[PDB]
Design a protein around this ligand. Structure first.
Ligand SMILES: CC1(C)CC(=O)c2c(C(F)(F)F)nn(-c3ccc(C(N)=O)c(N[C@H]4CC[C@H](O)CC4)c3)c2C1
Length: 207
Protein backbone atom coordinates (compact mmCIF):
# COMPACT_ATOMS: atom_id res chain seq x y z
CA UNK A 1 0.00 0.00 0.00
CA UNK A 2 1.41 3.38 -1.17
CA UNK A 3 -0.02 6.65 0.24
CA UNK A 4 -0.05 9.91 -1.77
CA UNK A 5 -1.12 13.50 -1.15
CA UNK A 6 -3.76 14.92 -3.50
CA UNK A 7 -2.68 17.96 -5.61
CA UNK A 8 -3.63 21.14 -3.58
CA UNK A 9 -6.52 22.10 -6.00
CA UNK A 10 -8.16 18.65 -5.67
CA UNK A 11 -7.73 18.51 -1.79
CA UNK A 12 -9.37 22.06 -1.68
CA UNK A 13 -12.24 20.83 -3.93
CA UNK A 14 -12.71 17.60 -1.85
CA UNK A 15 -12.74 19.65 1.42
CA UNK A 16 -15.44 21.91 -0.15
CA UNK A 17 -17.49 18.86 -1.42
CA UNK A 18 -17.16 16.72 1.78
CA UNK A 19 -18.19 19.65 4.08
CA UNK A 20 -20.88 21.40 1.92
CA UNK A 21 -24.51 21.52 3.00
CA UNK A 22 -25.44 21.73 -0.81
CA UNK A 23 -28.93 20.10 -0.82
CA UNK A 24 -28.91 18.77 -4.44
CA UNK A 25 -26.63 15.71 -3.57
CA UNK A 26 -28.47 13.35 -6.03
CA UNK A 27 -26.36 14.70 -8.98
CA UNK A 28 -23.46 12.37 -7.85
CA UNK A 29 -25.12 9.38 -9.60
CA UNK A 30 -25.43 11.01 -13.05
CA UNK A 31 -21.73 12.21 -12.68
CA UNK A 32 -20.40 8.68 -11.92
CA UNK A 33 -22.57 7.10 -14.67
CA UNK A 34 -21.16 9.83 -17.08
CA UNK A 35 -17.55 8.76 -16.16
CA UNK A 36 -18.59 5.11 -16.89
CA UNK A 37 -20.22 6.16 -20.23
CA UNK A 38 -17.00 8.08 -21.27
CA UNK A 39 -14.93 4.95 -20.31
CA UNK A 40 -17.24 2.70 -22.39
CA UNK A 41 -17.09 5.13 -25.36
CA UNK A 42 -13.22 5.00 -25.15
CA UNK A 43 -12.88 1.20 -25.13
CA UNK A 44 -15.58 0.87 -27.93
CA UNK A 45 -13.65 3.56 -29.95
CA UNK A 46 -10.25 1.90 -29.48
CA UNK A 47 -11.74 -1.52 -30.40
CA UNK A 48 -12.77 -0.18 -33.92
CA UNK A 49 -8.98 0.01 -34.89
CA UNK A 50 -7.85 -2.85 -32.53
CA UNK A 51 -10.63 -5.50 -31.93
CA UNK A 52 -8.28 -7.47 -29.56
CA UNK A 53 -8.90 -4.64 -26.94
CA UNK A 54 -12.26 -6.47 -26.32
CA UNK A 55 -10.56 -9.93 -25.56
CA UNK A 56 -10.92 -8.91 -21.81
CA UNK A 57 -14.77 -8.64 -22.35
CA UNK A 58 -17.09 -7.75 -25.26
CA UNK A 59 -20.08 -6.64 -23.12
CA UNK A 60 -20.33 -2.87 -22.62
CA UNK A 61 -22.62 -1.98 -19.72
CA UNK A 62 -23.14 -0.22 -16.35
CA UNK A 63 -24.38 -2.03 -13.17
CA UNK A 64 -25.76 -0.28 -10.05
CA UNK A 65 -25.39 -2.36 -6.87
CA UNK A 66 -26.95 -1.04 -3.64
CA UNK A 67 -25.98 -2.91 -0.45
CA UNK A 68 -28.02 -1.89 2.63
CA UNK A 69 -26.13 -4.21 5.06
CA UNK A 70 -22.68 -2.76 4.08
CA UNK A 71 -24.09 0.78 3.48
CA UNK A 72 -22.43 0.83 0.02
CA UNK A 73 -23.61 1.73 -3.46
CA UNK A 74 -21.33 0.23 -6.13
CA UNK A 75 -21.16 1.61 -9.76
CA UNK A 76 -19.64 -1.11 -12.08
CA UNK A 77 -18.66 -0.57 -15.74
CA UNK A 78 -16.81 -2.56 -18.42
CA UNK A 79 -15.12 0.58 -19.86
CA UNK A 80 -11.41 1.16 -20.68
CA UNK A 81 -10.47 1.06 -16.91
CA UNK A 82 -7.48 2.96 -15.43
CA UNK A 83 -3.75 2.23 -15.24
CA UNK A 84 -1.57 2.77 -12.09
CA UNK A 85 -0.20 6.11 -13.66
CA UNK A 86 -3.86 7.28 -14.35
CA UNK A 87 -4.75 6.73 -10.67
CA UNK A 88 -1.62 8.26 -9.12
CA UNK A 89 -0.98 11.22 -11.36
CA UNK A 90 -2.25 11.42 -14.97
CA UNK A 91 -5.99 12.01 -14.50
CA UNK A 92 -5.25 14.54 -11.67
CA UNK A 93 -2.76 16.40 -13.98
CA UNK A 94 -5.45 16.97 -16.72
CA UNK A 95 -8.07 17.81 -14.03
CA UNK A 96 -5.88 20.57 -12.42
CA UNK A 97 -7.15 23.58 -14.51
CA UNK A 98 -10.75 22.27 -14.43
CA UNK A 99 -10.68 21.88 -10.62
CA UNK A 100 -9.34 25.51 -10.11
CA UNK A 101 -11.97 26.94 -12.54
CA UNK A 102 -14.82 25.00 -10.90
CA UNK A 103 -13.83 26.45 -7.47
CA UNK A 104 -13.61 30.02 -8.96
CA UNK A 105 -17.12 29.42 -10.49
CA UNK A 106 -18.38 28.32 -6.97
CA UNK A 107 -16.79 31.52 -5.43
CA UNK A 108 -18.64 33.50 -8.23
CA UNK A 109 -21.95 31.99 -6.92
CA UNK A 110 -22.23 28.92 -9.28
CA UNK A 111 -23.96 25.67 -8.35
CA UNK A 112 -22.12 22.33 -7.40
CA UNK A 113 -24.33 20.59 -10.16
CA UNK A 114 -21.93 22.28 -12.75
CA UNK A 115 -19.03 19.93 -11.56
CA UNK A 116 -19.38 17.66 -14.68
CA UNK A 117 -18.84 20.66 -17.02
CA UNK A 118 -15.31 21.02 -15.39
CA UNK A 119 -14.47 17.31 -15.97
CA UNK A 120 -14.18 16.55 -12.19
CA UNK A 121 -17.61 14.93 -11.68
CA UNK A 122 -15.99 11.86 -10.00
CA UNK A 123 -15.43 13.98 -6.82
CA UNK A 124 -19.30 14.60 -6.54
CA UNK A 125 -19.22 11.07 -4.88
CA UNK A 126 -18.05 12.82 -1.70
CA UNK A 127 -21.45 14.61 -1.45
CA UNK A 128 -22.94 11.23 -0.32
CA UNK A 129 -19.87 9.08 0.57
CA UNK A 130 -17.58 9.23 3.57
CA UNK A 131 -15.06 6.97 1.67
CA UNK A 132 -14.73 5.97 -1.96
CA UNK A 133 -12.93 2.74 -3.11
CA UNK A 134 -12.05 2.50 -6.87
CA UNK A 135 -11.27 -1.07 -8.18
CA UNK A 136 -9.99 -0.84 -11.77
CA UNK A 137 -8.46 -2.88 -14.60
CA UNK A 138 -7.09 -1.50 -17.85
CA UNK A 139 -5.79 -3.82 -20.66
CA UNK A 140 -2.19 -2.48 -20.36
CA UNK A 141 -1.88 -3.00 -16.53
CA UNK A 142 -2.72 -4.97 -13.36
CA UNK A 143 -5.88 -4.65 -11.24
CA UNK A 144 -5.60 -1.81 -8.67
CA UNK A 145 -7.48 -0.46 -5.69
CA UNK A 146 -7.59 3.30 -5.09
CA UNK A 147 -9.10 4.62 -1.88
CA UNK A 148 -9.72 7.91 -0.10
CA UNK A 149 -11.84 9.18 2.87
CA UNK A 150 -10.53 12.65 1.80
CA UNK A 151 -8.50 14.53 4.51
CA UNK A 152 -5.74 15.11 1.87
CA UNK A 153 -4.48 11.59 1.10
CA UNK A 154 -5.38 8.57 -1.05
CA UNK A 155 -3.87 5.13 -1.30
CA UNK A 156 -3.07 2.88 -4.30
CA UNK A 157 -2.40 -0.93 -4.00
CA UNK A 158 -2.48 -3.95 -6.41
CA UNK A 159 -5.92 -5.55 -5.95
CA UNK A 160 -5.73 -9.22 -4.81
CA UNK A 161 -9.57 -9.50 -4.94
CA UNK A 162 -11.91 -10.92 -7.60
CA UNK A 163 -10.50 -10.37 -11.19
CA UNK A 164 -12.66 -7.96 -13.21
CA UNK A 165 -11.62 -8.68 -16.82
CA UNK A 166 -11.65 -4.88 -17.69
CA UNK A 167 -13.46 -1.84 -16.26
CA UNK A 168 -14.00 0.11 -13.04
CA UNK A 169 -15.97 -0.49 -9.79
CA UNK A 170 -16.60 2.71 -7.80
CA UNK A 171 -17.63 1.66 -4.23
CA UNK A 172 -19.41 4.45 -2.31
CA UNK A 173 -19.27 3.95 1.50
CA UNK A 174 -22.30 6.22 2.17
CA UNK A 175 -22.55 8.83 4.94
CA UNK A 176 -25.14 7.80 7.72
CA UNK A 177 -27.71 10.40 6.54
CA UNK A 178 -27.43 9.46 2.79
CA UNK A 179 -28.93 5.81 2.98
CA UNK A 180 -31.91 6.81 0.78
CA UNK A 181 -29.48 6.20 -2.22
CA UNK A 182 -29.61 2.41 -1.36
CA UNK A 183 -33.36 2.31 -2.02
CA UNK A 184 -34.42 0.75 -5.38
CA UNK A 185 -37.20 3.39 -6.03
CA UNK A 186 -34.74 6.27 -5.38
CA UNK A 187 -31.98 4.90 -7.71
CA UNK A 188 -34.66 4.24 -10.44
CA UNK A 189 -36.11 7.82 -10.23
CA UNK A 190 -32.56 9.43 -10.30
CA UNK A 191 -31.49 7.22 -13.29
CA UNK A 192 -34.78 8.09 -15.17
CA UNK A 193 -34.59 11.90 -14.33
CA UNK A 194 -30.90 12.71 -14.83
CA UNK A 195 -29.69 9.85 -17.03
CA UNK A 196 -27.19 10.68 -22.31
CA UNK A 197 -26.10 7.02 -21.73
CA UNK A 198 -25.86 4.82 -24.82
CA UNK A 199 -25.09 1.67 -22.72
CA UNK A 200 -27.45 -0.58 -20.64
CA UNK A 201 -27.72 0.56 -17.02
CA UNK A 202 -28.87 -2.33 -14.80
CA UNK A 203 -30.02 -1.89 -11.24
CA UNK A 204 -29.28 -4.97 -9.06
CA UNK A 205 -32.25 -5.29 -6.78
CA UNK A 206 -31.45 -6.74 -3.25
CA UNK A 207 -32.89 -10.22 -2.56
C1 LIG B 1 -8.35 8.53 -10.66
C2 LIG B 1 -9.56 8.77 -9.75
C3 LIG B 1 -9.53 7.73 -8.63
C4 LIG B 1 -9.50 10.19 -9.16
C5 LIG B 1 -9.70 11.30 -10.17
O1 LIG B 1 -9.11 12.38 -10.07
C6 LIG B 1 -10.61 11.03 -11.28
C7 LIG B 1 -11.08 11.80 -12.38
C8 LIG B 1 -10.77 13.21 -12.75
F1 LIG B 1 -11.22 14.06 -11.88
F2 LIG B 1 -9.49 13.44 -12.80
F3 LIG B 1 -11.31 13.56 -13.91
N1 LIG B 1 -11.88 11.09 -13.17
N2 LIG B 1 -11.92 9.83 -12.57
C9 LIG B 1 -12.64 8.77 -13.19
C10 LIG B 1 -13.46 7.95 -12.43
C11 LIG B 1 -14.03 6.83 -12.99
C12 LIG B 1 -13.80 6.50 -14.33
C13 LIG B 1 -14.41 5.23 -14.86
N3 LIG B 1 -15.57 4.82 -14.34
O2 LIG B 1 -13.81 4.58 -15.73
C14 LIG B 1 -13.00 7.36 -15.12
N4 LIG B 1 -12.77 7.06 -16.47
C15 LIG B 1 -12.00 7.80 -17.45
C16 LIG B 1 -10.51 7.44 -17.38
C17 LIG B 1 -9.69 8.13 -18.50
C18 LIG B 1 -10.30 7.92 -19.88
O3 LIG B 1 -9.60 8.73 -20.85
C19 LIG B 1 -11.76 8.30 -19.91
C20 LIG B 1 -12.55 7.55 -18.85
C21 LIG B 1 -12.43 8.49 -14.54
C22 LIG B 1 -11.16 9.78 -11.45
C23 LIG B 1 -10.86 8.62 -10.54
Amino acid sequence: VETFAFQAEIAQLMSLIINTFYSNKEIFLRELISNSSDALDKIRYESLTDPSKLDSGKELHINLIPNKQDRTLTIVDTGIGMTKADLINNLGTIAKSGTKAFMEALQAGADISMIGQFGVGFYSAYLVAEKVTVITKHNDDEQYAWESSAGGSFTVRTDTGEPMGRGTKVILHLKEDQTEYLEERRIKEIVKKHSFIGYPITLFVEK
